[PDB]
């Protein structure tokens, strides 16, 4: 939920979780030619407008051990 970090701040957000936990920028995406395939909505869509933090990154922080967003 509502914790808004944009641009540089959104990178910083990503870092403070997946800086150790491993990265993967799930937009509504896998990687490459990947289409619309996450109700999660978007990396940017979340972190800059709604959800980013320790919990509310993982899906798009990267979801490597926990599939975690809220």
Curated annotation (Swiss-Prot):
Disulfide bonds join 6-48, 18-61, 47-52. Residues 42-62 are annotated as: A. Residues 1-29 are annotated as: B. Changing residue 36 to E: Dominant-negative mutant, no effect on IGFR1-binding, defective in integrin-binding and the formation of ternary complex with integrins and IGFR1, defective in inducing IGF1 signaling and cell proliferation, and suppresses activation of IGF1R by insulin and tumorigenesis in vivo. Residues 30-41 are annotated as: C. Residues 63-70 are annotated as: D. It is found in: Secreted. Changing residue 50 to W: Found in a patient with primordial dwarfism; uncertain significance. Changing residue 37 to E: Dominant-negative mutant, no effect on IGFR1-binding, defective in integrin-binding and the formation of ternary complex with integrins and IGFR1, defective in inducing IGF1 signaling and cell proliferation, and suppresses activation of IGF1R by insulin and tumorigenesis in vivo. It is linked to Insulin-like growth factor I deficiency: An autosomal recessive disorder characterized by growth retardation, sensorineural deafness and intellectual disability. Forms a ternary complex with IGFR1 and ITGAV:ITGB3. Forms a ternary complex with IGFR1 and ITGA6:ITGB4. Interacts with SH2D3C isoform 2. Forms a ternary complex with IGFBP3 and ALS. The insulin-like growth factors, isolated from plasma, are structurally and functionally related to insulin but have a much higher growth-promoting activity. May be a physiological regulator of [1-14C]-2-deoxy-D-glucose (2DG) transport and glycogen synthesis in osteoblasts. Stimulates glucose transport in bone-derived osteoblastic (PyMS) cells and is effective at much lower concentrations than insulin, not only regarding glycogen and DNA synthesis but also with regard to enhancing glucose uptake. May play a role in synapse maturation. Belongs to the insulin family. This is Insulin-like growth factor 1. It comes from Homo sapiens. The lineage of its organism: Eukaryota, Metazoa, Chordata, Craniata, Vertebrata.
């Amino acid at each position: 939920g509502p914790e808004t970090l944009c641009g540089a701040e959104l990178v910083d957000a990503l870092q403070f979780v997946c800086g150790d936990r491993g990265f993967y920028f799930n937009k509504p995406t896998g990687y490459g030619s990947s289409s619309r395939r996450a109700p999660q909505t978007g990396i940017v869509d979340e972190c800059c407008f709604r959800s980013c933090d320790l919990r509310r990154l993982e899906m798009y922080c990267a979801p490597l051990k926990p599939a975690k967003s809220a």
